Design brief:
This is part of a larger assembly, with one copy of chain A and two copies of chain B.
Chain A (H helix, E strand, L loop, with lengths): L21 H8 L19
Chain B lengths: L11 H8 L4 H4 L2 H6 L6 E5 L6 H10 L4 E5 L1 H4 L7 H14 L3 E5 L2 H4 L15 H8 L8 E6 L18 E4 L5 H10 L13 H5 L6 H17 L6 H7 L24 H8 L22 E5 L10 H5 L5 E4 L19 H8 L3 E5 L23 H8 L10 E5 L18 E4 L7 H9 L12 H6 L5 H23 L2
Parallel strand pairs in B: 1-4, 1-5, 2-3, 3-4, 6-9, 6-10, 7-8, 8-9
Classes of the chains: A mainly alpha, B alpha/beta.
The site of one adenosine-5'-triphosphate has 18 residues of chain C, from helix 3.
Amino acid sequence: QIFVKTLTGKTITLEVESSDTIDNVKSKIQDKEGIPPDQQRLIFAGKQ
Amino acid sequence: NEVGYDDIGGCRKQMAQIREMVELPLRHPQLFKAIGIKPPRGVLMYGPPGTGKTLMARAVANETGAFFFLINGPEVMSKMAGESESNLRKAFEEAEKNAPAIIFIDEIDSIAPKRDKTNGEVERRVVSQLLTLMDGMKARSNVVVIAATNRPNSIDPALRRFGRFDREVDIGIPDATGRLEVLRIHTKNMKLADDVDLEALAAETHGYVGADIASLCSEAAMQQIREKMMDNFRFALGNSNPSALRETVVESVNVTWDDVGGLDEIKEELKETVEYPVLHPDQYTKFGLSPSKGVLFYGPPGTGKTLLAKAVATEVSANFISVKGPELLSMWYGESESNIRDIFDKARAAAPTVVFLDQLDSIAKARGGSLGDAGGASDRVVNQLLTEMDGMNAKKNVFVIGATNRPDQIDPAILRPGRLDQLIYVPLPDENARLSILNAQLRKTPLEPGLELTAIAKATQGFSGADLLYIVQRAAKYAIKDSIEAHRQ
Amino acid sequence: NEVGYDDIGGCRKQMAQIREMVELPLRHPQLFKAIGIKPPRGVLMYGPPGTGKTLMARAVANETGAFFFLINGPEVMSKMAGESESNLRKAFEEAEKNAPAIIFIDEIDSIAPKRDKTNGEVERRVVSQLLTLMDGMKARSNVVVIAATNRPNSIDPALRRFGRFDREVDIGIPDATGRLEVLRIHTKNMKLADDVDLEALAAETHGYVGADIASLCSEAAMQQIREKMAEVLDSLGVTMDNFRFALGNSNPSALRETVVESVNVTWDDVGGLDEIKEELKETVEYPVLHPDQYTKFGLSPSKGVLFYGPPGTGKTLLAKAVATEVSANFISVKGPELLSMWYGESESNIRDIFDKARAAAPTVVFLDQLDSIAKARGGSLGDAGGASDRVVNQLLTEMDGMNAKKNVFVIGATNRPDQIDPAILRPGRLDQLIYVPLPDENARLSILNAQLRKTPLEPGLELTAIAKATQGFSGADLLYIVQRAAKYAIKDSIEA
Ligand SMILES: Nc1ncnc2c1ncn2[C@@H]1O[C@H](COP(=O)(O)OP(=O)(O)OP(=O)(O)O)[C@@H](O)[C@H]1O
Ligand SMILES: Nc1ncnc2c1ncn2[C@@H]1O[C@H](COP(=O)(O)OP(=O)(O)OP(=O)(O)O)[C@@H](O)[C@H]1O
Ligand SMILES: Nc1ncnc2c1ncn2[C@@H]1O[C@H](COP(=O)(O)OP(=O)(O)OP(=O)(O)O)[C@@H](O)[C@H]1O
Ligand SMILES: Nc1ncnc2c1ncn2[C@@H]1O[C@H](COP(=O)(O)OP(=O)(O)O)[C@@H](O)[C@H]1O
């Protein structure tokens, strides 16, 4: 004719937010992004 | 899609006061300038879900031509507590740009819960963003916010204080004429015949929420399609389950005061107490205190106690709290006195509403200073019964019935005018009441009129009415056997 | 390799309910559905795990030539919120351009559980997008979403509204006529077989679902290879005892949970008690065989029958033959089995079986040995008597508070019929006063027809001689005169 009562407790979280390895950024630089319409980029030649 | 004002009814008394709350400050904002005060910003709605809470906001939006912004409850709160505060900042900024505008939100209990002992949720950073956003913006801007929820008491009390959500409306279940109006709306396109009824089809439902009317019409229409390779509405009630399935709002037995006979010292003595303050309260405010809540029923077993329980509950068409005898579940030591209090507060919210109990008088056995006793139940739950029964209010006029079969164990503190005081002995049905009970029960039987029940009343002298119900059951069970041996030959 | 037309036994009597919601929007929208009724799109398949829905949804796509999809519950929802939304959005726009299409969803309970104690809000994000995308497809999109789960009560009640999910079809466990086609499919791929029919082996495998039957043909085929090690394919013809070996090491699907199947007991296994049999053919069989007869008079039949007598007769043992005749479930509870150990721990354990008694209908519930509850009304005035007054009003209010239109019945059989509670012998709860004594002395030869049939001397006059000797012999003691055959005749006949 009796009872059992017990509560609980929690811990939410911690974070660091660590990212961006160096090998991904070196591949991130050597690319293209697009050029409007007529914004050619050119070639050039010389030094015969 | 494109809904209007004439698509829903029942809450027309509340629909008129809504049209002066969200259309009058938007169409005429200069009327509040002449009176000086600011127009109200927040009005919320509640009730059972599926009475058209989301369809009501879309009806008044298309009938005004204003901007209609929508933020869903369980959608924007499921993010990682960083984009919800910017979505609410984007909500009020876009509504200010294209004024006049309304803002409809639904399921605000999922956004704004209450603070309780079970801490561990987020419960912050989103509703506090709504607090600092709503208290401003009142520089005669044509913007209003409309909230919608299911449980109106799980909301945080900081919202319903002042200036944020001050006006409330209670769109509940419709009446018998309310379901009759939505039956004509949902059957405007189905080519029915002349055999269907509308008043009898609405009266045979008696507990159906407005979302069921679209489902019950499509179930009967699908049955009519299947017979090609129109009274199929009664087939749809036997197949489909009504909404609010396993709650305390059950209504499936439609026994009225005609189907129950006799006991004229109880029918007029129940009309004196539970129909007079709920219909004519103008005389009760100048002739003492209004309500006569408690009433007791005692007598022999099977004397017709609960036969009149659902009969009075369907006369005024109010709610019927069907709490059984051992409903004090008593899983521990403290919740056994607490689970009886929220059902009393629910009776005050849905007032007037009849509450039923059975044999909960246990303070005569709860003597002081002994050894044989329980661990906190059946001796301290009567101390809660000595303080939660007379918790009355003049704006509710509730009433509670009580049926027992042992009037010798009545507590000396429960037979009091502050408790259930009106005790009425339910006697045996005499030779005049035996005909009034049994003839109303074989009304559904297509019987022959040669057999009169006066011979049954002469053969039953000390029989109860439930024992007479076995006689018409045995007469019907052998009429089934008379019908079984009629189609095989 | 794809599925055939039907390809599953034990479902052809209910496969039309899933089928008829498919062709009727497309094969006739002019004369059948242009009245102004929108097509229902949400169905709900459920049942025990192993009835084969996943396939059943493949069979209706092959029979109609419609496009098929595959979405698993814990698979797509285990991705990110934006990732699961993009897979959900790209599946419905793909289904629009190839109408008719079938979108199969499985395991709804993992996506939408109940909200009684499941705290947190990560589940309500994805189920709000499912109800959103099910609305704007009104005009000509021939799509029917198939939701697959196990229990119908575990799904949220918000999903069962108008237009979202309407059809709740339940493919059940097949009988011997149903599972015979399942054995016919998984044996036509075999080279040879025995000269014994498969219905003789499927008669004892009653509570075996048709996913286990696909394994038992393979479970006995490998023992045929293990028995040896057309030159090695002559052993591939399975024998009737290797099925018994497969039944000897069988893992029954009903054994993995509680056993609630219907036993194969009948009325010819007992001798006598025919006055009870003619009374117990009207109370629970006439509502379920002729459901329109009691609705003509508007009076439902009586729910509840009470037995009382000596513990020797079969009053608790013949009640299983009452429910199993019309294939109803049997739940047997005992009086002094569950009680109030702590305080109030019995009334919650009484109404916990009433909800599942009407969900899986037809079921019955068998209350037995009421000499621990129905004896205390005004006699016991102790502390246990105060707890006795709290436990007897639970079942007294539940006898008239139960739903009597869901063919749920109580059957009682209790000794000591003098001190029964007076509020349980009232009509409506227990009104069939049927006394069950020991059976008659001339009806005791018909008891022994079940257990033994083969006797080279054919007795039956000496067994009635000791039956007619005295009236004090019980209905179970004379059944034990052939239960002692292993001590009488089988003992001295196996030494060879
Ligand atoms: N006057 C009315 N009363 C009740 N139901 C109506 C009425 N008019 C239409 N209905 C039907 O009821 C449905 C309204 O349900 P609704 O869209 O409000 O769901 P809800 O669950 O109440 O909304 P929420 O998700 O905000 O709780 C409509 O689909 C419509 O067919
Ligand atoms: N006016 C009446 N007089 C006598 N019997 C009635 C009357 N109306 C209905 N009855 C029958 O009596 C039964 C009422 O039983 P109920 O359990 O409600 O009260 P009861 O028999 O007094 O039970 P209890 O003794 O537990 O209070 C119904 O099943 C009904 O058929
Ligand atoms: N008519 C039939 N009834 C029962 N079982 C069948 C039938 N026909 C084939 N089977 C066998 O039963 C299996 C079907 O099980 P299924 O693939 O549906 O698993 P399931 O657990 O039901 O699916 P889900 O993962 O969606 O729950 C098949 O592997 C098949 O061999
Ligand atoms: N017609 C019958 N004649 C003799 N014995 C029977 C008969 N029916 C059942 N039994 C025996 O009685 C048992 C089932 O009923 P029983 O256990 O006697 O219930 P109770 O003990 O409550 O009377 C079975 O084990 C069976 O052997």
